[PDB]
Enzyme design. Structure first.
Site, PDB file in Angstrom:
ATOM      1  N   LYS A 140      43.231  37.209  37.466  1.00 51.74           N
ATOM      2  CA  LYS A 140      43.507  36.170  36.694  1.00 51.74           C
ATOM      3  C   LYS A 140      41.977  35.362  36.015  1.00 51.74           C
ATOM      4  O   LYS A 140      42.160  34.899  34.975  1.00 51.74           O
ATOM      5  CB  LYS A 140      44.501  34.930  37.277  1.00 51.74           C
ATOM      6  CG  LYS A 140      45.690  35.434  37.485  1.00 51.74           C
ATOM      7  CD  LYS A 140      46.719  34.400  37.845  1.00 51.74           C
ATOM      8  CE  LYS A 140      47.935  34.616  38.375  1.00 51.74           C
ATOM      9  NZ  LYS A 140      48.512  33.239  39.043  1.00 51.74           N
ATOM     10  N   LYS A 163      34.452  39.395  44.948  1.00 58.00           N
ATOM     11  CA  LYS A 163      35.247  38.760  43.742  1.00 58.00           C
ATOM     12  C   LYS A 163      34.482  37.888  43.195  1.00 58.00           C
ATOM     13  O   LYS A 163      33.940  36.716  43.701  1.00 58.00           O
ATOM     14  CB  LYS A 163      36.306  38.165  44.610  1.00 58.00           C
ATOM     15  CG  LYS A 163      37.556  37.635  43.579  1.00 58.00           C
ATOM     16  CD  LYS A 163      38.750  37.536  44.678  1.00 58.00           C
ATOM     17  CE  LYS A 163      40.019  37.537  43.651  1.00 58.00           C
ATOM     18  NZ  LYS A 163      40.244  38.394  42.577  1.00 58.00           N
ATOM     19  N   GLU A 194      36.162  41.651  52.512  1.00 52.02           N
ATOM     20  CA  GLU A 194      36.179  43.196  53.041  1.00 52.02           C
ATOM     21  C   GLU A 194      36.670  44.074  52.121  1.00 52.02           C
ATOM     22  O   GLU A 194      37.590  43.511  51.318  1.00 52.02           O
ATOM     23  CB  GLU A 194      37.253  43.228  54.242  1.00 52.02           C
ATOM     24  CG  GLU A 194      37.151  44.425  55.045  1.00 52.02           C
ATOM     25  CD  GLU A 194      38.426  44.295  56.295  1.00 52.02           C
ATOM     26  OE1 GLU A 194      38.550  45.446  56.893  1.00 52.02           O
ATOM     27  OE2 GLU A 194      38.817  43.110  56.471  1.00 52.02           O
ATOM     28  N   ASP A 228      51.545  34.952  52.571  1.00 53.88           N
ATOM     29  CA  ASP A 228      52.035  35.639  51.321  1.00 53.88           C
ATOM     30  C   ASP A 228      51.810  37.102  51.883  1.00 53.88           C
ATOM     31  O   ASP A 228      50.753  37.728  52.023  1.00 53.88           O
ATOM     32  CB  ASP A 228      51.298  35.563  50.057  1.00 53.88           C
ATOM     33  CG  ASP A 228      52.186  36.034  49.104  1.00 53.88           C
ATOM     34  OD1 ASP A 228      52.979  37.058  49.226  1.00 53.88           O
ATOM     35  OD2 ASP A 228      52.250  35.333  47.926  1.00 53.88           O
ATOM     36  N   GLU A 234      51.785  43.522  46.813  1.00 54.72           N
ATOM     37  CA  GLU A 234      50.725  43.310  46.054  1.00 54.72           C
ATOM     38  C   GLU A 234      49.546  42.341  46.879  1.00 54.72           C
ATOM     39  O   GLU A 234      48.662  42.505  46.197  1.00 54.72           O
ATOM     40  CB  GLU A 234      51.305  42.704  44.775  1.00 54.72           C
ATOM     41  CG  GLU A 234      52.159  41.339  44.843  1.00 54.72           C
ATOM     42  CD  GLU A 234      53.542  41.514  44.738  1.00 54.72           C
ATOM     43  OE1 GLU A 234      54.286  42.502  45.425  1.00 54.72           O
ATOM     44  OE2 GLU A 234      54.365  40.625  44.333  1.00 54.72           O
ATOM     45  N   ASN A 235      49.822  41.848  47.768  1.00 56.96           N
ATOM     46  CA  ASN A 235      49.086  41.202  48.463  1.00 56.96           C
ATOM     47  C   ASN A 235      48.561  41.674  49.848  1.00 56.96           C
ATOM     48  O   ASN A 235      48.234  41.113  50.751  1.00 56.96           O
ATOM     49  CB  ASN A 235      49.488  39.745  48.772  1.00 56.96           C
ATOM     50  CG  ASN A 235      49.389  38.793  47.543  1.00 56.96           C
ATOM     51  OD1 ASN A 235      48.819  39.096  46.507  1.00 56.96           O
ATOM     52  ND2 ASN A 235      50.571  38.080  47.241  1.00 56.96           N
ATOM     53  N   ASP A 286      43.769  37.982  50.974  1.00 53.47           N
ATOM     54  CA  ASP A 286      43.278  36.514  50.744  1.00 53.47           C
ATOM     55  C   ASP A 286      43.424  36.548  49.177  1.00 53.47           C
ATOM     56  O   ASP A 286      43.379  37.311  48.353  1.00 53.47           O
ATOM     57  CB  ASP A 286      41.910  36.084  51.082  1.00 53.47           C
ATOM     58  CG  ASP A 286      41.518  37.043  52.474  1.00 53.47           C
ATOM     59  OD1 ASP A 286      42.405  37.353  53.221  1.00 53.47           O
ATOM     60  OD2 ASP A 286      40.397  37.255  52.651  1.00 53.47           O
TER      61      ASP A 286
END
Ligand SMILES: CN1CCN(C(=O)c2ccc(Nc3ncc4c(n3)-c3ccc(Cl)cc3C(c3c(F)cccc3F)=NC4)cc2)CC1
Length: 268
Positions: free
Chosen positions: A20, A39, A88, A133, A137-138, A151
């Site tokens: 996002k 990231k 990771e 969560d 998708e996570n 994370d």
């Protein structure tokens, strides 16, 4: 005299995905040639979205968790306009993509994922980390196909169009959170029930055409199994999806449930 990380420490390679608020790249730490996922978050986008708080909270919690089934945050740094998270790399990608590819998983794959997840959550709860969560998708997959809880899910676009949200994602919300009751570590057992069902069936148990029906199905706990779901699986999922959080099993009971042990045989 800890490690001060800098961008200069890394060679950046191919993008792994757009988030996002920035992007994730395959990267190497230069001296070591160690492969990781870098990231990059753009502060101007973080500010615009009001999510810095989500980021400081998770970095704080995350920097302190070490578990083979939780994706490791090795470190972080920032400059004037960017925040960088040194994560990771999970070579096999997300569980969600793999569930799209296959439509559904078999009992061995599912029960093995559940074991991994139960171990990770049990470790989290021992550190007073709650309400993780664990939507597909996570969840990421390591090189041996081991599951890794990712994370910073809030920093990645939700699937395709399929998931709707409210105070979190509707499909995974427990009844205590939608009847405005108090909630605790027992939310994670509800999530595990929804996930197990999604793994086995290919869709979550309260999926409906409207948004208000999905809500009524959860509160009333209205779910059914396709004919192919075996009785051990129905039993586990039915025990996990109890309306009353207190009657949900302990994670240890999940780990020793006969369906889990018949189908999850990998040494932990
Ligand atoms: C050769 N091809 C095979 C197909 N590919 C993948 O699907 C794929 C995607 C990602 C990876 N691994 C990976 N490992 C760690 C992370 C990510 N991705 C990654 C990549 C892109 C994005 Cl946008 C996020 C993330 C998240 C992450 C997250 F931080 C929160 C939730 C979910 C996540 F995947 N965490 C870091 C591996 C394969 C591309 C490469």
């Amino acid at each position: 005299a800890k490690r001060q990380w800098a961008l200069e420490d890394f060679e950046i390679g191919r993008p792994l995905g757009k988030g996002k608020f920035g992007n994730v790249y395959l990267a190497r730490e230069k001296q070591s040639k160690f492969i990781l996922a870098l990231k990059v978050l753009f502060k101007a986008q973080l500010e615009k979205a009001g999510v810095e708080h989500q980021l400081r909270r998770e970095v704080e919690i995350q920097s302190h968790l070490r578990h083979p089934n939780i994706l490791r945050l090795y470190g972080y740094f920032h400059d004037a306009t960017r925040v960088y998270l040194i994560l990771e790399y999970a070579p096999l990608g997300t569980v969600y993509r793999e569930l799209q590819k296959l439509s559904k998983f078999d009992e061995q794959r599912t029960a093995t994922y559940i074991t991994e997840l139960a171990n990770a959550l049990s470790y989290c709860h021992s550190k007073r980390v709650i309400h993780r969560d664990i939507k597909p998708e996570n969840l990421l997959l390591g090189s041996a196909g081991e599951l890794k809880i990712a994370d910073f899910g809030w920093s990645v676009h939700a699937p395709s169009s399929r998931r709707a949200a409210l105070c979190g994602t509707l499909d995974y919300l427990p009844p205590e959170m939608i009847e405005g009751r108090m909630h605790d570590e027992k939310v994670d057992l509800w999530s595990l029930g929804v996930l197990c069902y999604e793994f086995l069936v290919g869709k979550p148990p309260f999926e409906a055409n409207t948004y208000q029906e999905t809500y009524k199905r959860i509160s009333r706990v209205e779910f059914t199994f396709p004919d192919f779901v075996t009785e051990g699986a129905r039993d586990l999922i039915s025990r996990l999806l109890k309306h009353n959080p207190s009657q949900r099993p302990m994670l240890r009971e999940v780990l020793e449930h006969p369906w889990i042990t018949a189908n999850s045989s990998k040494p932990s």
